[PDB]
């Protein structure tokens, strides 16, 4: 999420037993970082 010029990241990782379908239940995401980025962000792309 990017708001007020600040970029924020929230995340968590846990094990599962499924393959193609997302797991049910509930799991919150704790914050990770908050940087005063400020750029007029409009798009994104991944890496692998």
């Amino acid at each position: 999420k990017n708001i007020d010029g600040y970029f924020k990241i929230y995340s968590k990782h846990t094990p599962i037993n499924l393959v193609r379908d997302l797991p049910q239940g509930f799991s919150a995401l704790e914050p990770l970082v908050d940087l005063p980025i400020g750029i007029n962000i409009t798009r994104f792309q991944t890496l692998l």
């Binding site: 007020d4 010029g5 005063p36 980025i37 400020g38």
Partner: protein, 48 residues
């Protein structure tokens, strides 16, 4: 050429001299605040 010159010339130095000749280094602060989410200030001095 005649009546022509290059304005780029090197500093005139001596081993040591008083005011006027003396190389004195100056630093200038930046422009106005609030233009970005960044922050640059002295420490928020805490007490016991």
């Amino acid at each position: 050429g005649f009546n022509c010159y290059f304005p780029l010339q090197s500093y005139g130095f001596q081993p040591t001299y008083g005011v006027g000749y003396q190389p004195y280094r100056v630093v200038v602060l930046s422009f106005e605040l609030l233009h970005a989410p960044a922050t640059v200030c002295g420490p928020k001095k805490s007490t016991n």
